[PDB]
Amino acid sequence: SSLLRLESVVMPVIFTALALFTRMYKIGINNHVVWDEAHFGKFGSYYLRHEFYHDVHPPLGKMLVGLSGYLAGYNGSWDFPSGEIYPDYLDYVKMRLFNASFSALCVPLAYFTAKAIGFSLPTVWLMTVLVLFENSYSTLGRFILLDSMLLFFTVASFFSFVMFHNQRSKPFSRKWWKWLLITGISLGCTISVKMVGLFIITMVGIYTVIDLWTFLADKSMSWKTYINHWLARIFGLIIVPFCIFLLCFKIHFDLLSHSGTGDANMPSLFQARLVGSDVGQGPRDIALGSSVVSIKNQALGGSLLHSHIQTYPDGSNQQQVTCYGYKDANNEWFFNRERGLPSWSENETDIEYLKPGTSYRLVHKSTGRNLHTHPVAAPVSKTQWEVSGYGDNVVGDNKDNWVIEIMDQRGDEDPEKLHTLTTSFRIKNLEMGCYLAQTGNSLPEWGFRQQEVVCMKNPFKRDKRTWWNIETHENDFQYPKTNFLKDFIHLNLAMMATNNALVPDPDKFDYLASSAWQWPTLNVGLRLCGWGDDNPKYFLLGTPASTWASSVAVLAFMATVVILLIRWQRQYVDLRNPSNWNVFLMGGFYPLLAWGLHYMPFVIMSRVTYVHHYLPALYFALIILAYCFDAGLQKWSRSKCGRIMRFVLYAGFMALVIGCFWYFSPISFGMEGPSSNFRYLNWFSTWDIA
Amino acid sequence: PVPELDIKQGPVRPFIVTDPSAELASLRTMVTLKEKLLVACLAVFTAVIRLHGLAWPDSVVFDEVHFGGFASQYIRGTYFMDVHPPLAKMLYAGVASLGGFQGDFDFENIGDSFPSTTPYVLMRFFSASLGALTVILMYMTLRYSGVRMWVALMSAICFAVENSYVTISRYILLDAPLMFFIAAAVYSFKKYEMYPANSLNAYKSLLATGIALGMASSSKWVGLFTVTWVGLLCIWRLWFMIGDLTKSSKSIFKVAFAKLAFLLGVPFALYLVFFYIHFQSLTLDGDGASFFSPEFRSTLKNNKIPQNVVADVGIGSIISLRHLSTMGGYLHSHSHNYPAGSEQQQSTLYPHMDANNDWLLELYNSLTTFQNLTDGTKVRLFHTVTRCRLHSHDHKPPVSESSDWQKEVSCYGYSGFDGDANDDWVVEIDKKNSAPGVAQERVIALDTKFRLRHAMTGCYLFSHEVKLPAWGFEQQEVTCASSGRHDLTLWYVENNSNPLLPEDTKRISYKPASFISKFIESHKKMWHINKNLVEPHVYESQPTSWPFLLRGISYWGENNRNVYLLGNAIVWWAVTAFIGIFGLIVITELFSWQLGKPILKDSKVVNFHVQVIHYLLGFAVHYAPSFLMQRQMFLHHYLPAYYFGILALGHALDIIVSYVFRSKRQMGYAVVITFLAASVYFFKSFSPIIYGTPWTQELCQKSQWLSGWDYNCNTYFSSLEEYKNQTLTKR
Ligand SMILES: CCCCC/C=C\C/C=C\CCCCCCCC(=O)O[C@H](COC(=O)CCCCCCCCCCCCCCC)COP(=O)([O-])OCC[N+](C)(C)C
Ligand SMILES: CCCCC/C=C\C/C=C\CCCCCCCC(=O)O[C@H](COC(=O)CCCCCCCCCCCCCCC)COP(=O)([O-])OCC[N+](C)(C)C
Ligand SMILES: CCCCC/C=C\C/C=C\CCCCCCCC(=O)O[C@H](COC(=O)CCCCCCCCCCCCCCC)COP(=O)([O-])OCC[N+](C)(C)C
Ligand SMILES: C=C(C)CCCC(=C)CCCC(=C)CCCC(=C)CCCC(=C)CCCC(=C)CCCC(=C)CCC[C@@H](C)CCOP(=O)(O)O
Ligand SMILES: *[C@@H]1O[C@H](CO)[C@@H](O)[C@H](O)[C@H]1NC(C)=O
Ligand SMILES: *[C@@H]1O[C@H](CO)[C@@H](O)[C@H](O)[C@H]1NC(C)=O
Q1: Same structural domain for residues A149 and A35?
Q2: Residues A149, A171: one domain?
């Protein structure tokens, strides 16, 4: 009618205004850096100085922190430490205003989300005051974080997901392609803010699979229409959210182009491309004798060629040649002429340029032995022989002959000769016939815990382990552009490797870390700043009205899919009309699947997990709680006493999350007291809140 | 042999009834004389094959030293610690002592010839006899699963011929009792399948499924995966019983609750009984209980655990601290220096009692008083032997050097001449992990569990499970860590004595090992060793290379003979080829089903897909958890899943004979006689790798089909004739 249009217009701006008030009330009060504003504020400061860095998370959240830096009048000059006050030129209130504006847009998007997943009108208001009045969302909204951004693109992913579901009756329409593309863009932004945005794309993806599964059942759907459904779902659900991801690494790689911290995680050609460039040399590449080099392995895990002064205790008693991964003067090497020819002298006139395909002897500078493989087997790998250094220019054998073999040339010069950083060369023995290889594993402690060097009989040229390049040259030129897909793959594999380095040791008590079963039932919270009586001190836990009742709604619905499934097998017909089945499927079932996909990896994985990882997984849980008010009280709408009891149960629980949000409000609104004034909201132990 | 489906009409869709007739029970059991004659012939053939040439490897074989030596530990009674549950080691102890075995032979290392005092051929006979009964249980399991008589005959003959079970069952190994009780669990549960779930026969089959299922679970922890397999099978059967409308709801809850009682309460009951016979028979104390708590060891006989120590401890008492969480713990300090840091006197966790574990509690500031150790008392630990304090200068740790936390603690000081504030240790009693009373207030020996906070660094006294190789071998590390784990920070005091206390002092001793604490503590050591079992065994295999039979494991090499585990490959590759073909054909039946074409019309195809989902699920639940294990594992961990694979391939030969060659069953029997004949040919060719009998080298080179498996192929002679003129060495 006309009143429902009035509520449908003026009510989203009441919830919007309460989101602007709930997330921006004490933004500029703390005046100190907090939980991960120290990290992500620094990462946003890296984009303003255009300096390269490395981080676990995909860059769209950090590029939006940098976008808030451009919108805050800030040039990135101040790194963000922990605990310290802000300088006067950095206006942190604009950035906290920016991300609290993202959560302040996460609330009305939950209003229209609940307006989309069926939900007779009191359930939309309960779900909107349920996402709205929460101290966890309004705590992590308050800061320079990409947890608010991950929450916003997760809620936008589910909103455009149901707004894609609602035009399932009219496929290939303007609304169908519209919300399919908006679904793809929001999903790709959900990955590119943080990698645990894969989880929603599992859920949506499972939905997509079910659609294609049930599109086999349509006898009226032709094969042309069905293959068009496949092309539409792979375009707007695979091609688009991966193209947004690639575009975020295009703005990431093409935006920052200087040197910074974490620059050593890249191949040295990409490090040579950027403006800092502490790994390159201008005029010359390499020559004979006088060119002192340090040779790097291009494989993931390979390092510099090291030769320390000790000898082998296992073998023919020659010098140990291994691979070490830091700067050292003992990593220096140079080339010399082969066996039978007179070697290099320091008073030569012809600066000879090296020729590939010709044998040379790699002589170390600070020690002075020949690079060699000797007929004693390698210690760890018993298949191949062992690499050592022996003698000098006149003492050795015929097995010291190592050729230089061209694999790839990175243009802009003569590709026939050996070069620095533009020559992936293999080193092959002449008499034996083995390629110089590296296993990448660890050695025992006789060789000071360094890399294993082998020489395989028959490897293939498609292996990255035998490729070597010159990194440092010692006695007008711009390095070419690297491939963007290769920098994409190597930087993502470096992100995965830093995720492998994030596993904690069990001997150390991480005071900040938590387990996933503690995030429902509120066993522990999270302490986000310094707990002195001066600063306002903030705390992370949900309102125990929303996520206790939401947690028992998840446990009360996960044991309702089973009951309706048993009664389905017992020939009951539960959900007759497509309306209540639509509210079950989109309002109840897929938030249970998205709850499990956003929550169960955090209880399965062996990684450091915190309370702020539960903020997307709570959201779908809250939707389930709205469904536990929607279908659970739907039968009461026919009797007038059931109507009045239903509206006072909606208004009773909504008022209960008003009162329980407002009671626990200073842990999101600030706690300006001396931390002993706030023991009244210290209900349990392990809530280290006072 | 298999009946037609009995589907009825529900109010919405047709439902299948799940009450089998008595005719279904009569067609699948030994009701005739020809079937009993073929079980007799299969038991004669299996009893020849699985038991041939026994005691010809008259030395110990791979992991016969372990479970044989542990059987010797049960006969001697001295306590040992092993990964595995007791029943299939204590069972070799009962088979040993029933044959006249009195310990006396430590099963040391592979190659030790048996003296004429140890019964091994009777233990080998027990292992190979259970490995010969699992063949007959595969025949009867398969026939109970709904299967032609002759195809189960030829498939079970094809299972007695499988090489990996003759190798794994012939020797003193855990997988032949394990595989017997797993085969008895699928046996008794398929016997439960064919009964109408209300009669007394079905509850006898649930009772045998319970005692065999938990007698598999108490032999090795892959039997818990058979508990999981039977459990998912029961979710299947309760799903179809809910689908059945002629069954009342009270009957479905009765089958579900009696199924829950016989299938979890009986495995847990038999598991607790078998650990009670474990803890009841293994009474003595040896070096095997080196890493248990002193209350655990307090139940064992012939103890060196200190009993009746002085409870109330004062300042001036010569005490000995002991680390709670790490089992090898005492505060230890002897005159040998570090190679790094300050190179002072080292502080270690030495697990045994010495005089160097003694520490005076002296005040920071000797009187005639007895000042108690209250909560918050800063003291100094004065080592009485080497004349030194406990000192926590901020230098590099010895072996945990990559630590921004974990400050290093050492020993340096002069009594009365060099006493500073950097030797102070505030005692902070943890009031949760200590027992309440006086010990929760002040320090009591064996009863409180305090934490030593260093007073001038704010860091606590810490230790963990990393030893020190520099000096003081097999001794751990003492540090002073901030934000170290609260479990690893707890210390408690024992073996205290001071002259400022009367002789009639209230002594204290340890709680003596309650069974639940014995049980849970023992299982924490089970899971702790089983989780942290990383060793370089060159015959270690990979779980994703098991279903292709490349690079099998080696067993024994002596006197120009060798024993090597490599399964029957022409059966192995048809098991896993049938995993691929059945997965592909059930994908094409789902796509072909929903695309519009009808599937599952003939009842033999329905029972085929039902039982191969049942056995493919046994292949899944016994092999998929072997990927989520961060430990070492070999080819004999695939083998409980491989039993379900040869069950499923049994049904594959049944769908070759029974459905796709209905008009011409001579060609189905031709396919099964070529598969069986090729299997028995693979056994007859690879018989001298199982029993440790003579091959020749010119055939040992030819037999290696894949280059993956390699078993010291130059060990054999040039011909068999040289084996008759041979004397053999005995280690
Ligand atoms: C403070 C908040 C706490 C959270 C709420 C807690 C519990 C309530 C949860 C669910 C209420 C039911 C809403 C979903 C059911 C939709 C299906 C439906 O409604 O259909 C129901 C059938 O389903 C059922 O009876 C079975 C579901 C009952 C499950 C509730 C008990 C589960 C266990 C609870 C334990 C809780 C604690 C556990 C953890 C400690 C009737 O079919 P019909 O033909 O009339 O369908 C309408 C068709 N016409 C329109 C033609 C009439
Ligand atoms: C995948 C892992 C799954 C793990 C969980 C597995 C099982 C537990 C699931 C549910 C347990 C409660 C089931 C209540 C269903 C009510 C249906 C109903 O109310 O309808 C009942 C049917 O009774 C049933 O069939 C219930 C079967 C019992 C299910 C199996 C027993 C549970 C096993 C215990 C496991 C532990 C449980 C606790 C775990 C937290 C009334 O039917 P009727 O014959 O009177 O009317 C005829 C229908 N006309 C009118 C249309 C014709
Ligand atoms: C019929 C439906 C009834 C239900 C049964 C369902 C499935 C039964 C099949 C397999 C049991 C599940 C076990 C794997 C589950 C976890 C997946 C996993 O993870 O393993 C997968 C694949 O491994 C497998 O090759 C599974 C082998 C299954 C047996 C053979 C299947 C057929 C293939 C041969 C077909 C031959 C051609 C046919 C025509 C002749 C990878 O392993 P990964 O990630 O550890 O590798 C990474 C290792 N790093 C971490 C160290 C790097
Ligand atoms: C619903 C009903 C009506 C009735 C109920 C139905 C039912 C019977 C069950 C309801 C259905 C159900 C799902 C149950 C849960 C299963 C249950 C009881 C318990 C969980 C069992 C588990 C899967 C896991 C936890 C336990 C572990 C300690 C597992 C550690 C694994 C191992 C590391 C094994 C190592 C052994 C070997 C591999 C290596 C050594 O090899 P070597 O010899 O040294 O080389
Ligand atoms: C960045 O802004 C601050 C604000 O005072 C200024 O001091 C600094 O010089 C600026 N740096 C650059 C590189 O513009
Ligand atoms: C030390 O405290 C305990 C705690 O009750 C008390 O029993 C004991 O008498 C005290 N020591 C002295 C010397 O009073």
Answers
A1: yes
A2: yes
- Look up residue B685 and give its two tokens: 């060719």
Give yes or no: residues A312 and A433 share one domain.
Answer: yes
Q: HSE-up of B170 (CA within 13 Å, CB side)?
A: 33
Q: What are A's interface residues with B at a Cβ cutoff of 8 A?
A: 213, 216-217, 219, 506-511, 566, 569-571, 573
- Select from B464, B591, B594 the Cβ nearest to the Cβ of A507: B464
| Closest ligand (CA of A622) | 1
Q: How far is A483 from chain B (nearest CA, A)?
A: 34
B11: contact with A, CB 8 A cutoff: yes
Crossing angle for the helix pair A240-255 and A484-500, nearest 10 degrees?
Answer: 90
- Give the phi and the psi of residue A186 in degrees, each rounded to 5: -70, -35
Contact list, A566 vs chain B (CB under 8 Å) = 242
| A25 lies in some domain | yes
Is A262 in the same domain as A391?
yes
Q: Which residue lies with its CA nearest to atom 10 of ligand 3?
A: B620
Q: Is B641 in the pocket of ligand 4 (CB under 6 A)?
A: no
Q: Which of A126, A571, A574 to mutate to test the pocket of ligand 1 (most atoms within 8 A of CB)?
A: A574
Choice from A77, A79, A90 to test ligand 5 binding pocket (greatest atom count within 8 A of CB): A77
Q: Do A571 and B596 touch (CB under 8 A)?
A: no
Confirm whether A428 is domain-assigned.
yes
Query: Domain check: are A384 and A394 in the same one?
Result: yes
User: How would you classify the pairing of strands B377-383 and B561-565?
Assistant: unpaired
d(CA B561, CA A507): 48
Q: Do B242 and A569 touch (CB under 8 A)?
A: yes
Contacts of residue A658, defined as CB under 8 A and 6 or more positions apart, other chains included, come to A129, A133
Q: Which residue range forms the structural domain that includes residue A372?
A: 258-481
Q: What H or E segment, with its residue span, contains residue A498?
A: helix A484-500
Distance CA B147, CA B647 (A): 11
Domain of B329, CATH number, reads: 2.80.10.50
DSSP B632: -
B647 burial level (CB within 10 Å; 0-12, 13-18, 19+): buried
A589 domain residue, yes or no: yes
Nearest CA in chain B to A214: B594
Do B309 and B492 touch, CB atoms closer than 8 A? no
Cβ atoms within 10 Å, residue B199: 12
Structural domain ending residue among the three candidates A447, A481, A515: A481
Torsion of Cα atoms, B618 then B619 then B625 then B631, to 10°: 130
Place of tokens 């399991």: B141
Same domain, A453 and A362: yes
Closest C-alpha among A280, A279, A272, A324 to residue A301? A324
How far apart CA A262 and CA A286 sit, in angstroms, is: 28
- How close are the terminal C-alpha atoms of chain A, in Å? 51
State the sign of the Cα–Cα–Cα–Cα dihedral B650, B654, B655, B660: positive
Taking the C-alpha atoms of residue B118 and residue B104, their distance in angstroms, rounded to an integer, is: 8
Rounded CA-CA distance B130/B181 in Å is 9
Q: Does residue A330 share a domain with residue A224?
A: no
| Domain with B368 in it | 299-525
Give the method used: cryo-EM
Nominal resolution (angstroms): 3.2
Cα of A560 vs centre of ligand 1, distance in Å, is 6
Same domain, A505 and A578: yes
What is the count of structural domains for chain A? 2
Handedness of CA B246, B249, B253, B256 (dihedral sign): positive
**Residue A85 located in a structural domain:** yes
Report the residue of A569, A573, A576, A685 to disrupt the B interface, i.e. the one with the largest count of B CBs within 10 Å: A569
Among B10, B11, B485, select the one facing A509 at the smallest CB separation: B485
